[PDB]
Amino acid sequence: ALYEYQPLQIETYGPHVPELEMLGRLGYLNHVRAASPQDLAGGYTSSLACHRALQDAFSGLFWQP
């Protein structure tokens, strides 16, 4: 009865959001404000903001009541 990680299956009804760790490589973080040293020291990265904003833009773009 061993555990195996399955990702959370949540239908977003919108375009694919790139993974948080890929945002730097894909060039998204060039268009979000840099997290300050104090922000970074607490674990707040510009990648969080950017990822939240893309997810909100794509959430339910295709959904119809």
């Binding site: 997810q55 909100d56 339910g60």
Partner: protein
């Protein structure tokens, strides 16, 4: 998140006809109470709608001059609370002047915009006694408002989605060289969209994208490749057609939006005051 939100589930309606039916039911359900208690004193649904449009404008004015600076998120939430409230309630039963302030008051708490009661009612242009009366009325209706919202307090506004699309366009759509030239006109169109029933009929993402593509169309920029190439709707042509029809439908709501006329509002205000004098 919008895609599993109460907003999507319970407060995004199939059509204007379905809204008009909720509002019509509200108007006749009040009339049936007032007649059962005890003439042309009663407002017709189209008159209620004119007053609600007028008070929604007064809610925006309130939130715009509110010190300390109210975040757009709180204003969006308050305006949504106001629209939702008057789907299922008559302006003849609950005065929209009180409900609109109670909307702003609740929105400030829900959106974690920490203001004390006195600094809230400090923003009203009334005597200290008037502000204390206003506060007592807001406290009386705060639970009523929450009940009529069915305790669905999180509102998804189009503003974050709007930010997400601008990041995406700047990253993946270099054909649009500077996407920030769309911001002012796209914001102007978002404001206009907000005056309509759009917030009850479309997703925040759909609203945000409509604003951006409307602003693009006014600029002369034909950016249908963003939908087909970047959003990958060239694969799913029906999903593309469905999306273009939502945006057309939303552009049509804004074109056919009539603002309340001064002389009309004055007459319906006097009529509204007369309804609340007797109850």
């Amino acid at each position: 998140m919008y895609h599993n939100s109460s907003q999507k589930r319970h407060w995004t309606f199939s059509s204007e006809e379905q809204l008009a039916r909720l509002r019509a039911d509200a108007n006749r359900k009040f009339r049936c109470k007032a007649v059962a208690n005890g003439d042309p004193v009663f407002l017709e649904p189209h008159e209620e709608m004119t007053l609600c449009k007028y008070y929604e404008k007064r809610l925006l004015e309130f939130c715009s001059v509110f010190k300390p600076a109210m975040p757009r998120s709180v204003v969006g939430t308050a305006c949504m609370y106001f629209k939702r409230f008057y789907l299922n309630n008559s302006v003849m039963e609950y005065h929209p002047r009180i409900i609109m302030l109670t909307c702003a008051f609740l929105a400030c708490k829900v959106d974690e915009f920490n203001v004390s009661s006195p600094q809230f009612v400090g923003n009203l242009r009334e005597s200290p006694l008037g502000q204390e009366k206003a506060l007592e009325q807001i406290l009386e209706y705060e639970l009523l408002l929450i009940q009529q919202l069915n305790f669905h307090l999180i509102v998804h506004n189009p503003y974050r989605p709007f930010e997400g699309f601008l990041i995406d366009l700047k990253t993946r759509y270099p054909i649009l060289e500077n996407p920030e030239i769309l911001r002012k006109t796209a914001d102007d169109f978002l404001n206009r969209i907000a005056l309509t029933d759009a917030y009850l009929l479309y997703t925040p993402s759909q609203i945000a994208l409509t604003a951006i593509l409307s602003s693009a169309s006014r600029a002369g920029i034909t950016m249908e490749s963003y939908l087909s190439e970047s959003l990958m709707l060239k694969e799913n042509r029906t999903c593309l057609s469905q999306l273009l029809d939502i945006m057309k439908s939303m552009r049509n709501l804004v074109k056919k939006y009539e603002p309340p006329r001064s002389e009309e509002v004055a007459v319906l205000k006097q009529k509204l005051e007369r309804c609340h004098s007797a109850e």
